Design an enzyme around this catalytic site. Structure first.
Site, PDB file in Angstrom:
ATOM      1  N   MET A   1       4.645 -42.782  94.291  1.00 36.25           N
ATOM      2  CA  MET A   1       5.284 -42.467  95.444  1.00 36.25           C
ATOM      3  C   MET A   1       6.749 -42.642  95.393  1.00 36.25           C
ATOM      4  O   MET A   1       7.257 -41.509  96.209  1.00 36.25           O
ATOM      5  CB  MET A   1       4.894 -43.827  96.576  1.00 36.25           C
ATOM      6  CG  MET A   1       3.322 -43.767  97.096  1.00 36.25           C
ATOM      7  SD  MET A   1       2.908 -45.120  97.939  1.00 36.25           S
ATOM      8  CE  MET A   1       4.338 -45.318  99.394  1.00 36.25           C
TER       9      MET A   1
ATOM     10  N   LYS B   1      12.522 -24.845 112.432  1.00 35.26           N
ATOM     11  CA  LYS B   1      11.669 -25.631 112.895  1.00 35.26           C
ATOM     12  C   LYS B   1      11.187 -26.626 111.998  1.00 35.26           C
ATOM     13  O   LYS B   1      11.453 -26.397 110.651  1.00 35.26           O
ATOM     14  CB  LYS B   1      10.557 -25.110 113.667  1.00 35.26           C
ATOM     15  CG  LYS B   1       9.749 -24.140 112.529  1.00 35.26           C
ATOM     16  CD  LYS B   1       8.787 -23.014 113.192  1.00 35.26           C
ATOM     17  CE  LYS B   1       7.912 -22.472 112.161  1.00 35.26           C
ATOM     18  NZ  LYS B   1       7.337 -21.153 112.769  1.00 35.26           N
TER      19      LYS B   1
ATOM     20  N   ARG C   1      -2.863 -17.618 118.517  1.00 32.77           N
ATOM     21  CA  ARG C   1      -2.399 -19.093 118.623  1.00 32.77           C
ATOM     22  C   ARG C   1      -1.991 -19.079 119.985  1.00 32.77           C
ATOM     23  O   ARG C   1      -2.338 -20.186 120.588  1.00 32.77           O
ATOM     24  CB  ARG C   1      -1.153 -19.379 117.456  1.00 32.77           C
ATOM     25  CG  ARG C   1       0.036 -18.576 117.601  1.00 32.77           C
ATOM     26  CD  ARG C   1       1.145 -19.634 117.713  1.00 32.77           C
ATOM     27  NE  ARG C   1       1.598 -20.181 116.527  1.00 32.77           N
ATOM     28  CZ  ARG C   1       2.607 -19.778 115.672  1.00 32.77           C
ATOM     29  NH1 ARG C   1       3.497 -18.882 116.165  1.00 32.77           N
ATOM     30  NH2 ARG C   1       3.071 -20.345 114.557  1.00 32.77           N
TER      31      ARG C   1
ATOM     32  N   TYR D   1      -0.395 -44.986  86.831  1.00 31.74           N
ATOM     33  CA  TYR D   1      -1.606 -45.377  87.327  1.00 31.74           C
ATOM     34  C   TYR D   1      -2.802 -44.762  86.654  1.00 31.74           C
ATOM     35  O   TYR D   1      -2.748 -43.579  86.483  1.00 31.74           O
ATOM     36  CB  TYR D   1      -1.457 -45.204  88.998  1.00 31.74           C
ATOM     37  CG  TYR D   1      -0.506 -45.903  89.610  1.00 31.74           C
ATOM     38  CD1 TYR D   1      -0.611 -47.356  89.630  1.00 31.74           C
ATOM     39  CD2 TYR D   1       0.241 -45.325  90.207  1.00 31.74           C
ATOM     40  CE1 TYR D   1       0.625 -48.030  90.198  1.00 31.74           C
ATOM     41  CE2 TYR D   1       1.368 -46.098  91.176  1.00 31.74           C
ATOM     42  CZ  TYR D   1       1.408 -47.384  91.012  1.00 31.74           C
ATOM     43  OH  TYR D   1       2.716 -48.065  91.676  1.00 31.74           O
TER      44      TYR D   1
HETATM   45  C1  LIG Z   1       3.756 -49.898  96.000  1.00 30.53           C
HETATM   46  C2  LIG Z   1       3.643 -51.160  95.361  1.00 30.53           C
HETATM   47  C3  LIG Z   1       2.765 -52.264  95.623  1.00 30.53           C
HETATM   48  C4  LIG Z   1       1.730 -52.088  96.650  1.00 30.53           C
HETATM   49  O1  LIG Z   1       0.565 -51.725  96.015  1.00 30.53           O
HETATM   50  P1  LIG Z   1      -0.715 -51.278  96.681  1.00 30.53           P
HETATM   51  O2  LIG Z   1      -1.435 -50.821  95.600  1.00 30.53           O
HETATM   52  O3  LIG Z   1      -0.359 -50.173  97.839  1.00 30.53           O
HETATM   53  O4  LIG Z   1      -1.361 -52.775  97.390  1.00 30.53           O
HETATM   54  C5  LIG Z   1       2.974 -53.628  95.089  1.00 30.53           C
HETATM   55  N1  LIG Z   1       4.046 -53.908  94.020  1.00 30.53           N
HETATM   56  C6  LIG Z   1       5.133 -52.754  93.555  1.00 30.53           C
HETATM   57  C7  LIG Z   1       5.938 -52.925  92.290  1.00 30.53           C
HETATM   58  C8  LIG Z   1       4.813 -51.247  94.221  1.00 30.53           C
HETATM   59  O5  LIG Z   1       5.660 -50.539  93.700  1.00 30.53           O
HETATM   60  C1  LIG Z   2       7.742 -20.162 112.339  1.00 30.07           C
HETATM   61  C2  LIG Z   2       8.071 -18.956 113.317  1.00 30.07           C
HETATM   62  C3  LIG Z   2       9.230 -17.834 112.951  1.00 30.07           C
HETATM   63  C4  LIG Z   2       9.629 -17.861 111.616  1.00 30.07           C
HETATM   64  O1  LIG Z   2       8.737 -17.131 110.803  1.00 30.07           O
HETATM   65  P1  LIG Z   2       8.972 -16.876 109.315  1.00 30.07           P
HETATM   66  O2  LIG Z   2       7.837 -15.989 108.672  1.00 30.07           O
HETATM   67  O3  LIG Z   2       9.289 -18.541 108.275  1.00 30.07           O
HETATM   68  O4  LIG Z   2      10.338 -15.852 108.818  1.00 30.07           O
HETATM   69  C5  LIG Z   2       9.378 -16.634 113.982  1.00 30.07           C
HETATM   70  N1  LIG Z   2       8.870 -16.683 115.196  1.00 30.07           N
HETATM   71  C6  LIG Z   2       7.676 -17.699 115.637  1.00 30.07           C
HETATM   72  C7  LIG Z   2       7.155 -17.613 117.004  1.00 30.07           C
HETATM   73  C8  LIG Z   2       7.585 -18.887 114.703  1.00 30.07           C
HETATM   74  O5  LIG Z   2       6.570 -19.836 114.907  1.00 30.07           O
END
Ligand SMILES: *Cc1c(COP(=O)(O)O)cnc(C)c1O
Ligand SMILES: *Cc1c(COP(=O)(O)O)cnc(C)c1O
Ligand SMILES: *Cc1c(COP(=O)(O)O)cnc(C)c1O
Lengths: 372, 372
Positions: free
Chosen positions: A314, A39, A137, A266
């Site tokens: 990012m 999943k 759940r 930054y």
């Molecule tokens: C991410 C990025 C932006 C956008 O910046 P913001 O703060 O989200 O407006 C502008 N110029 C460069 C070079 C970037 O990597």
């Molecule tokens: C996510 C999930 C699993 C897998 O469990 P793990 O702890 O990652 O081994 C098995 N049964 C259900 C119902 C789940 O949601």
């Protein structure tokens, strides 16, 4: 169209690792069937790759969280049984019925609904009934409710009573006797039904690892252990070894000396504490690497140990190193270089962040590659 | 094959929000062009939708982090200029050159390697030259290196000198004067060039919001502000309103009473304080909802204010409410219901997690839908 194959940033997924992880967990529980729970894009590791590795590792069926994830597997070419372990709008039961997908239901009226969707189509739906034993759940909460629901599926000719199952809250954990509780709750909620399903299954990674003898483990629903991660709280020692499936690497795109006092990132809050070299790699927190992974080690291919500095941005991370590094040099964020290694656990420790949450943050923008 | 259309959990993206945001930012700065920076699947919001909303809002060009993102934009049918703001392997320059994609380079030998890739192909590549004025991520570090590179693209007829640019580290922030530092540094590295580029640009959301007068804002590289998020550190007031673009909803799939002292979630660590009702929804942290989001308010469609209890699981979340709630009822995790609102900021405050990190956490598994 999410992955970026032309960017030299990758997630490596070890085939030999996954193979070992299933073997060792299956061995521990003498399971007969391993259900690979993939999943959430395979715990964010990459579904096409993990599905393939899982079958290679010896899994024989799949568990997914929802119908659309099940569809994807079918679309990938798999014909193996697939269980949807979450709940599904009955209006869409037809799709599961058409692609041999087993659907969970938690309500007599929803069961009825799904059957009436199929009435007259010549289709047939495999149905599972989770029993809620303490996780609270989803699932049936009373024997009476359960027995009524079973009655309904027996009266619907388009339905197959495929299974009953329950899921543990603390199999992950020193809390035995919540484990024992859920097991007596099962006995309470489930004792002699008017009819049996084709199968029943109980065990997740935790059960299979730390409590193999508490309950039937012929069918194991194996999620996290597959990926070689110890998710226990607190970290509990295991009867075997897990080897993590994923490592994380990229190649330097920008390389430059920087002088003592130069600000990086930054906020201009990191200042180089002495003369050195600053190394920029093309993965950031939008790829899944911890927003506050700054200060983490980073293993340069030349054997240097650098450290992330400035913000983790990012799309890019900057690494301080003592010795020059050429553009193109790979840097391993997670994995092994020589006799040095960085693990998801080191990452969790550093960020003061849950390893389950960290192992699950990797975006599809990273290109995946299967290895050994 | 990532989104889950049959699961009733969506990200709604407000057209009127994005329009207002761009308008208001454009106005405060009197920009002539706005470049939508939609890297990282548009800050995890959803690229096809955000691109479309960006253009509707008045953006006339795009900025992305890498070649492959630019490629996806083109394959969405967009014809507007696209600037790649990260660095790219020169071997793949042809792909950009074929699709009218502008490419950044931080080095003379990379500019030369890219030109040679194109020689005799008949193609032309638009090249940008990022100048590092103090962020220290990528870009030229000396006037000497800059000019040698400007000469190289001049000597290469397969290349066009499209732009020079730089990016600020603290425009996000009250640290004016590192702002001033970068601006003098610009002057230092950049004064009388042998030839001028077609264009230059400097401003991000920060510059455009808090320092519009410090430097030319004809072209704004608008990222975070487009999505109506104030990411400043510490939270700074703005000369306008931002209205957040994203909200997050999902319909109840499982609904039951639970009794005082009942335990919920992994670890069985939450105990119901009184008799009540437990509402399970199909979104978890694998979708991007905060992993430690437990305790958050959740706004049910019937007017009830519930709370997330137990774990935020990978794919599901459980919500405690005083009064019973029907299956199929929508719950708002982020957004507005009546006179109640939950914002990304509420979420950052509650999780003690950066809002820039949180706004970037959403998986493509969630279905996107454009509203108002
Ligand atoms: C991410 C990025 C932006 C956008 O910046 P913001 O703060 O989200 O407006 C502008 N110029 C460069 C070079 C970037 O990597
Ligand atoms: C996510 C999930 C699993 C897998 O469990 P793990 O702890 O990652 O081994 C098995 N049964 C259900 C119902 C789940 O949601
Ligand atoms: C009654 C009550 C509880 C019960 O929770 P337990 O852990 O089972 O004792 C918890 N919190 C409050 C405020 C209560 O009134």
């Amino acid at each position: 169209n999410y992955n970026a194959p032309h960017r030299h940033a990758v997630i490596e997924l070890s085939q030999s690792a996954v193979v070992h992880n299933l073997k060792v967990i299956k061995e521990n529980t003498h399971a007969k069937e391993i259900m690979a729970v993939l999943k959430a894009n395979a715990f964010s590791h990459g579904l096409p790759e993990m599905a393939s590795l899982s079958i290679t590792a010896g899994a024989t069926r799949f568990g997914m969280a929802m119908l659309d994830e099940a569809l994807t597997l079918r679309d990938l070419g798999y014909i193996q049984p697939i269980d949807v372990l979450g709940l599904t709008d009955p209006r869409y039961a037809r799709l599961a019925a058409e692609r041999n997908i087993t659907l969970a239901f938690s309500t007599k009226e929803s069961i009825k609904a799904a059957a009436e969707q199929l009435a007259g189509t010549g289709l047939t739906l495999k149905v599972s009934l989770p029993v809620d034993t303490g996780l609270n759940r989803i699932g049936f909460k009373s024997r009476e409710d359960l027995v009524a629901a079973i009655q309904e599926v027996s009266a619907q000719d388009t339905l197959i009573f495929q299974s009953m199952w329950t899921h543990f809250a603390t199999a992950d954990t020193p809390n035995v006797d919540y484990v024992d509780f859920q097991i007596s709750e099962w006995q309470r909620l489930t004792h002699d039904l008017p009819v049996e399903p084709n199968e029943k299954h109980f065990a997740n990674t935790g059960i299979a690892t730390w409590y193999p003898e508490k309950i039937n483990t012929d069918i194991v629903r194996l999620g996290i252990g597959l990926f070689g991660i110890n998710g226990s709280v607190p970290i509990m020692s295991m009867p075997f070894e897990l080897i993590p499936a994923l490592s994380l690497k990229a190649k330097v795109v920008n390389s430059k000396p920087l002088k003592k006092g130069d600000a990086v990132g930054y906020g201009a809050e990191y200042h180089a504490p002495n003369d050195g070299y600053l190394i920029t790699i093309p993965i950031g927190h939008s790829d899944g690497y911890p927003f506050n992974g700054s200060g983490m080690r980073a293993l340069v291919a030349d054997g240097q140990i650098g450290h992330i500095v400035g913000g983790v941005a990012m799309d890019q991370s900057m690494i301080f190193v003592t010795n020059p590094v050429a553009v193109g040099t790979t840097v391993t964020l997670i994995g092994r270089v020589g006799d040095q290694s960085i693990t998801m656990q080191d990452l969790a420790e550093h960020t003061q962040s849950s390893i389950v949450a960290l192992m699950n943050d990797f975006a599809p923008r990273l290109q995946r590659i299967i290895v050994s």
